[PDB]
Design an enzyme around this catalytic site. Sequence first.
Site, PDB file in Angstrom:
ATOM      1  N   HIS A  12       0.788  -1.365   0.104  1.00 16.64           N
ATOM      2  CA  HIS A  12       0.003  -0.167  -0.155  1.00 16.64           C
ATOM      3  C   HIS A  12       0.739   0.678   0.411  1.00 16.64           C
ATOM      4  O   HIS A  12       0.147   2.400  -1.150  1.00 16.64           O
ATOM      5  CB  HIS A  12      -0.881   0.057   0.559  1.00 16.64           C
ATOM      6  CG  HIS A  12      -2.051  -0.629   0.830  1.00 16.64           C
ATOM      7  ND1 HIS A  12      -3.005  -1.623   2.187  1.00 16.64           N
ATOM      8  CD2 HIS A  12      -2.624  -1.139  -0.054  1.00 16.64           C
ATOM      9  CE1 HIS A  12      -3.768  -2.708   1.108  1.00 16.64           C
ATOM     10  NE2 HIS A  12      -3.637  -2.178   0.560  1.00 16.64           N
ATOM     11  N   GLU A  27       1.310   3.686  -3.602  1.00 17.22           N
ATOM     12  CA  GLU A  27       1.169   5.373  -3.358  1.00 17.22           C
ATOM     13  C   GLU A  27       2.982   5.642  -4.153  1.00 17.22           C
ATOM     14  O   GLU A  27       2.345   6.937  -4.504  1.00 17.22           O
ATOM     15  CB  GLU A  27       0.727   6.412  -2.425  1.00 17.22           C
ATOM     16  CG  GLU A  27      -1.030   5.005  -2.008  1.00 17.22           C
ATOM     17  CD  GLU A  27      -1.720   5.818  -2.692  1.00 17.22           C
ATOM     18  OE1 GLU A  27      -2.703   4.316  -2.589  1.00 17.22           O
ATOM     19  OE2 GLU A  27      -1.556   6.475  -3.594  1.00 17.22           O
ATOM     20  N   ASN A  85       3.230   8.386  -7.784  1.00 17.42           N
ATOM     21  CA  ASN A  85       3.418   9.987  -7.602  1.00 17.42           C
ATOM     22  C   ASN A  85       4.737  10.476  -7.913  1.00 17.42           C
ATOM     23  O   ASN A  85       4.211  11.048  -8.782  1.00 17.42           O
ATOM     24  CB  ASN A  85       3.656  10.564  -5.704  1.00 17.42           C
ATOM     25  CG  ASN A  85       2.291  10.406  -5.322  1.00 17.42           C
ATOM     26  OD1 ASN A  85       1.036  10.663  -5.931  1.00 17.42           O
ATOM     27  ND2 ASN A  85       2.078  10.283  -3.702  1.00 17.42           N
TER      28      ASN A  85
HETATM   29  C1  LIG Z   1       5.659  18.610 -12.072  1.00 13.47           C
HETATM   30  C2  LIG Z   1       4.692  17.346 -11.969  1.00 13.47           C
HETATM   31  N1  LIG Z   1       5.079  17.513 -10.129  1.00 13.47           N
HETATM   32  C3  LIG Z   1       4.651  17.025  -9.790  1.00 13.47           C
HETATM   33  O1  LIG Z   1       3.296  15.962  -9.694  1.00 13.47           O
HETATM   34  C4  LIG Z   1       4.949  17.186  -8.365  1.00 13.47           C
HETATM   35  N2  LIG Z   1       5.245  16.044  -7.574  1.00 13.47           N
HETATM   36  C5  LIG Z   1       6.227  15.607  -6.732  1.00 13.47           C
HETATM   37  O2  LIG Z   1       6.820  15.666  -6.509  1.00 13.47           O
HETATM   38  C6  LIG Z   1       5.854  14.562  -5.899  1.00 13.47           C
HETATM   39  C7  LIG Z   1       5.011  14.248  -4.689  1.00 13.47           C
HETATM   40  C8  LIG Z   1       5.035  13.599  -3.762  1.00 13.47           C
HETATM   41  C9  LIG Z   1       5.902  12.352  -3.934  1.00 13.47           C
HETATM   42  O3  LIG Z   1       5.947  11.284  -3.383  1.00 13.47           O
HETATM   43  C10 LIG Z   1       6.716  12.121  -5.327  1.00 13.47           C
HETATM   44  C11 LIG Z   1       7.170  13.478  -5.930  1.00 13.47           C
HETATM   45  O4  LIG Z   1       7.555  13.546  -6.811  1.00 13.47           O
HETATM   46  C12 LIG Z   1       3.742  15.733  -7.184  1.00 13.47           C
HETATM   47  C13 LIG Z   1       3.469  13.943  -6.948  1.00 13.47           C
HETATM   48  C14 LIG Z   1       2.204  13.618  -6.636  1.00 13.47           C
HETATM   49  C15 LIG Z   1       1.157  14.056  -5.782  1.00 13.47           C
HETATM   50  O5  LIG Z   1       0.219  13.936  -5.618  1.00 13.47           O
HETATM   51  C16 LIG Z   1      -0.549  14.268  -5.372  1.00 13.47           C
HETATM   52  C17 LIG Z   1       1.372  15.833  -6.112  1.00 13.47           C
HETATM   53  C18 LIG Z   1       2.869  16.143  -6.405  1.00 13.47           C
END
Ligand SMILES: CCNC(=O)CN(C(=O)c1ccc(O)cc1O)c1ccc(OC)cc1
Length: 336
Positions: free
Chosen positions: A224, A228, A232
């Site tokens: 789990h 996630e 992400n």
């Molecule tokens: C331009 C693309 N930019 C992102 O999408 C930033 N983005 C991160 O950078 C990031 C955040 C959380 C994570 O565990 C890993 C990540 O790379 C992000 C990924 C998932 C998320 O869900 C709500 C929110 C932000």
Amino acid sequence: GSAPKYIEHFSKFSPSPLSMKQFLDFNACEKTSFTFLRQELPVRLANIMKEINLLPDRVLSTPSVQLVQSWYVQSLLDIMEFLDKDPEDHRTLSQFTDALVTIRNRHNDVVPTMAQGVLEYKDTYGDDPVSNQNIQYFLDRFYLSRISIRMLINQHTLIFDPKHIGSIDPNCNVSEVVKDAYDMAKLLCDKYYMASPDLEIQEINAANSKQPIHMVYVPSHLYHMLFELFKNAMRATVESHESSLILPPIKVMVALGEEDLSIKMSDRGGGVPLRKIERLFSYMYSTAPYGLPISRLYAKYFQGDLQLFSMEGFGTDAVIYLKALSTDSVERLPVY
Ligand SMILES: CCNC(=O)CN(C(=O)c1ccc(O)cc1O)c1ccc(OC)cc1
Ligand SMILES: CC(C)c1ccc(COc2ccc(CC(=O)NCCN)cc2Cl)cc1
Ligand SMILES: [Mg+2]
């Protein structure tokens, strides 16, 4: 009905944190699972239920809350029937396992259900930082309670229907779980985006440099979380590099120290500014119509943690911290 008095009685007790060892060494008979559970499930139910009733009336009386309250009440009662019943009689034990099933299933929707109470509270009273700290405070506790209830129920129903011990694996090969989770994320990744980054695993077994790393854990919990996180880091990695040609891999390191087992997931998805990092773990600030916050709870549940550090313009590391030794893996339970 007695419901409120039951709640009053059983909320004078304290939930009893078990260790993964104590879980493992259970089968030391159903009788004993039965007699234990008929006391303890009522305890854990009561405790959160009285905490639910400390919620102010404007929250307390929305449909969402009142709805889950009704479920918890029916469960407490379903478990009541079995207090004067006795073991040695094998239908008692069988009718119990069935009762435990119905309960778990009844509760399958608490997450979306509560999440609905947050939304109608956002639109109804505001999204101020105070409301946020209370929502955060209450739900961290509520879900965590909830997880441990499932943990008990699954330990019972699965064992009293060998390599595994219910939802526990005493030989959990972490990279095995890392890949599975990876493979599944990629599949979803290749569907929506028709591109997907690769995976690099590296292990670092401190005490035994060339030994594959195994622990005692609950692998579905671990799946789990890693799931996630992969989602992400893939999502970010793709959208950050859609005008570019190279797609950077996701590097995972799994590290085993004297007391920590730690899993870092590094991606080059362009990062997130420090300012926005709290919002990601906030139930309220990430509600739109699991995520990170619930995966974190899973980490916390057995004295672990799950942390995020980004570098805006580059990438994000996400680390799952788990206790290495069954002795240290005790349940973290809220109490009233
Ligand atoms: C331009 C693309 N930019 C992102 O999408 C930033 N983005 C991160 O950078 C990031 C955040 C959380 C994570 O565990 C890993 C990540 O790379 C992000 C990924 C998932 C998320 O869900 C709500 C929110 C932000
Ligand atoms: C449905 C769930 C998710 C939900 C939705 C929304 C909320 C909101 O909870 C609040 C909001 C404000 C206050 C301040 C206050 O009045 N304090 C009085 C005592 N100092 C307390 C609480 Cl518990 C909780 C739970
Ligand atoms: Mg953090």
